[PDB]
Design an enzyme around this catalytic site. Structure first.
Site, PDB file in Angstrom:
ATOM      1  N   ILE A  75       0.915  -1.179   0.000  1.00 34.18           N
ATOM      2  CA  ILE A  75       0.000   0.000   0.000  1.00 34.18           C
ATOM      3  C   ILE A  75       0.934   1.205   0.000  1.00 34.18           C
ATOM      4  CG2 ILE A  75      -1.902   1.188   1.107  1.00 34.18           C
ATOM      5  CD1 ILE A  75      -0.934  -2.325   2.503  1.00 34.18           C
ATOM      6  N   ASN A  76       0.646   2.145  -0.898  1.00 31.38           N
ATOM      7  CA  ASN A  76       1.447   3.373  -1.076  1.00 31.38           C
ATOM      8  C   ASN A  76       0.835   4.563  -0.398  1.00 31.38           C
ATOM      9  OD1 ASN A  76       3.337   2.171  -3.078  1.00 31.38           O
ATOM     10  ND2 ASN A  76       1.577   1.967  -4.199  1.00 31.38           N
ATOM     11  N   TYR A 126       2.016  -4.001  13.657  1.00 34.91           N
ATOM     12  CA  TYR A 126       3.165  -3.127  14.032  1.00 34.91           C
ATOM     13  C   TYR A 126       4.286  -3.346  13.033  1.00 34.91           C
ATOM     14  CZ  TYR A 126       5.414  -0.650  17.863  1.00 34.91           C
ATOM     15  OH  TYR A 126       5.989   0.290  18.732  1.00 34.91           O
ATOM     16  N   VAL A 127       5.047  -2.233  12.995  1.00 40.73           N
ATOM     17  CA  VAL A 127       6.271  -2.189  12.123  1.00 40.73           C
ATOM     18  C   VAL A 127       7.366  -3.117  12.586  1.00 40.73           C
ATOM     19  CG1 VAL A 127       8.028  -0.639  11.248  1.00 40.73           C
ATOM     20  CG2 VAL A 127       5.695   0.149  11.505  1.00 40.73           C
ATOM     21  N   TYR A 185       7.705   1.251  22.311  1.00 38.29           N
ATOM     22  CA  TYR A 185       7.966   2.668  22.573  1.00 38.29           C
ATOM     23  C   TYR A 185       8.920   2.912  23.747  1.00 38.29           C
ATOM     24  CZ  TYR A 185       3.796   3.592  19.774  1.00 38.29           C
ATOM     25  OH  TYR A 185       2.841   3.678  18.756  1.00 38.29           O
ATOM     26  N   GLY A 208       4.330  17.155   8.408  1.00 42.33           N
ATOM     27  CA  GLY A 208       5.685  17.565   8.361  1.00 42.33           C
ATOM     28  C   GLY A 208       6.609  16.574   9.127  1.00 42.33           C
ATOM     29  N   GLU A 246      -0.703   2.794  14.643  1.00 41.96           N
ATOM     30  CA  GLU A 246      -1.734   3.143  15.624  1.00 41.96           C
ATOM     31  C   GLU A 246      -2.945   3.737  14.987  1.00 41.96           C
ATOM     32  OE1 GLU A 246      -1.257   1.819  18.427  1.00 41.96           O
ATOM     33  OE2 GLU A 246       0.760   2.216  19.186  1.00 41.96           O
ATOM     34  N   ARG A 261      -4.940   0.849  13.848  1.00 42.80           N
ATOM     35  CA  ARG A 261      -5.606   0.197  14.974  1.00 42.80           C
ATOM     36  C   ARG A 261      -6.772   0.984  15.515  1.00 42.80           C
ATOM     37  NH1 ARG A 261      -0.387  -1.037  18.695  1.00 42.80           N
ATOM     38  NH2 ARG A 261       0.343  -2.971  17.719  1.00 42.80           N
TER      39      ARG A 261
END
Lengths: 263, 263
Positions: free
Chosen positions: B5-6, B76-77, B119, B138, B173, B176
């Site tokens: 997915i882009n 999750y990554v 985290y 940003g 997140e 989710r």
């Protein structure tokens, strides 16, 4: 005049009873108050008398009719008219005794029973529990005639009490519970007459407490479970409103809804 | 190849990020498992490796791209590729170390960090808590470039850790939680960059426990409440799934759903 909804047992079908119950619910509740997808009846406090009742005109294949009066605040039957006589259950309090003076006002003979309309009372009078009184289209046809002949001496008090038991369940309790409407639809579809099973009896017995538990729940979660029964008599514990959304169609007002308090 | 997915930060709008998050959720979950209107991610137990990951290709206005790999079992990554180098968080166990050998298989330089992606770890590395790391378009543009220049020495480890913190929140997140997607949509709509408020932090911290509580609930009712925070830091107690239906979009699988057990 208070709203009238008509139903007949003559040639009744699943669709004509469905239409009837849906019309009754639409006159009982206005749409203002829906908690967990479940509508609430109007609050009795402050309710104007012109909004307090609805009338259910019941006819049968014997070409007799009676009119039941239902209190919108609880969906229950408070009395009935047949031709020139009207009869009312014994009121719970002075405000309810005054309110019923606004029903069937031109009838020539008005009577108040010395008994109320609660099932414990009516089952003592009938000489049979709900579990031993058949429900269906034939019971209801018969109950309409029994109510119609009461004023002329043709109906003995146990038959009149049994006939109220039949009407209250097939109209009031079916309006309150889609589950109980569905059990009456199945009796018409298969032309069955059969006494209510324990799922029907325990829903009837628990309607008030289910109303309070839903309305005082924490985001739908009951503080204390409610035990019902399944059709075979075994126990079903209710912990949340979610499981009741297909079951209960209206509730008696028990508190104001808490603030929306969304995250 | 695993599904891709882009998304680009260049000219991002509320609609293009919405489309992106909805596409990510559609590749994470299949539809098989939906409890209380809330989808469940696939169970890791027995999941074939060919179904285990999806890829998120992130581009920015600086015409750089990185590819994040997400585990479908938790959203999750697990690592990322930039050009000819790939980097993976330290695996929790041998099965996860083997699984990540199936990602970015033709990349010339493969690295495993000695740290994981949780985290607490990443905030120690970054030298800042989530509450002090701005999120928005940003930050994400900047985080994409920082990940892209890591292999050439241009990104210091605290910047790389901060950049993972930004990506994980704005992709994982947000996938989710519709609530967290909505907070990122508001940042794009108003071109705001701002650190996550306590509602965002406590939802992130509670995702696992909310997943378990929903799935082990009694008909939606939690056995024990979960305390979250509102945007101003004050306490919000969760007692039932109902209040989370607009908030949480997917859950980690925690148990099999009990039998339907309808009344």
């Amino acid at each position: 005049q208070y709203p009238i909804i008509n139903f007949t047992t003559a040639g009744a079908t699943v669709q004509s009873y469905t239409n009837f119950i849906r019309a009754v619910r639409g006159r009982l509740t206005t749409g203002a108050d829906v908690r967990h997808e479940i509508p609430v009846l109007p609050n009795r406090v402050g309710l104007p008398i012109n909004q307090r009742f609805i009338l259910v005109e019941l006819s049968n294949h014997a070409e007799l009719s009676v009119t039941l009066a239902l209190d919108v605040t609880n969906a229950y039957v408070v009395g009935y008219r047949a031709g020139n006589s009207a009869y009312f259950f014994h009121p719970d309090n002075q405000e309810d005794a005054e309110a019923i003076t606004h029903l069937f006002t031109d009838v020539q003979n008005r009577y108040t029973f010395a008994f109320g309309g609660a099932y414990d009372r009516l089952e003592q009078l009938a000489g049979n529990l709900r579990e031993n009184i058949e429900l269906g289209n034939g019971p209801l046809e018969e109950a309409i005639s029994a109510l119609y002949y009461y004023s002329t001496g043709g109906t003995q008090l146990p038959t009149l009490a049994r006939s109220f038991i039949i009407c209250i369940q097939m109209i009031s309790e079916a309006a309150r519970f889609q589950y109980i409407e569905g059990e009456m639809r199945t009796r018409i579809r298969y032309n069955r007459r059969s006494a209510p099973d324990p799922s029907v009896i325990t829903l009837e017995n628990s309607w008030g407490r289910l109303s309070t538990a839903i309305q005082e729940s924490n985001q739908g979660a009951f503080a204390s479970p409610i035990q019902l029964q399944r059709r075979n008599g075994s126990k079903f514990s209710v912990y949340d409103v979610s499981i009741l959304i297909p079951i209960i169609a209206l509730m008696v007002y028990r508190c104001a809804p808490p603030p929306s308090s969304q995250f």
